[PDB]
Write a protein that binds this ligand. Sequence first.
Ligand SMILES: [Zn+2]
Length: 335
Amino acid sequence: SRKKTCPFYKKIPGTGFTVDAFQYGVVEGCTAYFLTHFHSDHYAGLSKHFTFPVYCSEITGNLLKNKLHVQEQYIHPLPLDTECIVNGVKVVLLDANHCPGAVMILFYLPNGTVILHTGDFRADPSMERSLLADQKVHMLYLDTTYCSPEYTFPSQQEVIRFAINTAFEAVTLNPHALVVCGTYSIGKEKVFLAIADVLGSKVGMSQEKYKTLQCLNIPEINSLITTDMCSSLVHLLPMMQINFKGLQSHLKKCGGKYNQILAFRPTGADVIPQTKGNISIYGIPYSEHSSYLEMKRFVQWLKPQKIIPTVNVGTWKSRSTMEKYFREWKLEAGY
Ligand SMILES: [Zn+2]
């Protein structure tokens, strides 16, 4: 398999900087590799053999060190909201409101171009009150995961309220019911923690997952999570188990102590579960990405001059369609 070459949307023009570009070997000219967050599509390629500078948040740096064994000497964690000079360039990391340690990166280029790379983010009104507020941003590298008008979904808070009210009612109807959530990466902690909290329980999980959550600076985490599954009413399983076979199979462990499973999994408030026997799976629209409305609001507020989409950029047609939305957002706001 021939190593691929770093595409342009991961390069910061005229700098020696790349963002989330670890799977291409030595990128020619790259002197500093930024990692926006610890999701595998973004970190793919990093390992103990990576020997160029990696800039990232402190949570991401802990994860690089402890899970991927990146050598400490190449990990450069930067605090949020604070100007840092990197190979002569002024950079600022901001909270992306995505998963723990996820950042957006503000680059002040020598030539006066100001660039915002959102990494993955879920656009919030609070970003309109950050450092972004101060100077003009010319070029925006935008997380366009849900850059389509049909992508609507409630706030995280509405989804979590649905989830805790559902779980509560479920265990009131059956004290021997088990609540399950799936995971395959960091993020979405707020969902299983709010469930566990409403059930007065800790979240039961594997040794591996318990260690990962230690890297995340979640206040009093050890009081909320546990590896003793049999003591907990909320279990966290691999996403691949969240299906009737995996769940029927989990119900046979802990010695048949539980006789029903209620499971939550993200889609693909006001939802129909799939039910087979004593297993129910609710697909809930919990998202760590901007909805189409959230994205449009943020961009109309930021008023950038050029937008480089970084998701769903696999076809010309898709790239053009996004550009067309962006041009419509300009026409409508005026900028
Ligand atoms: Zn992500």
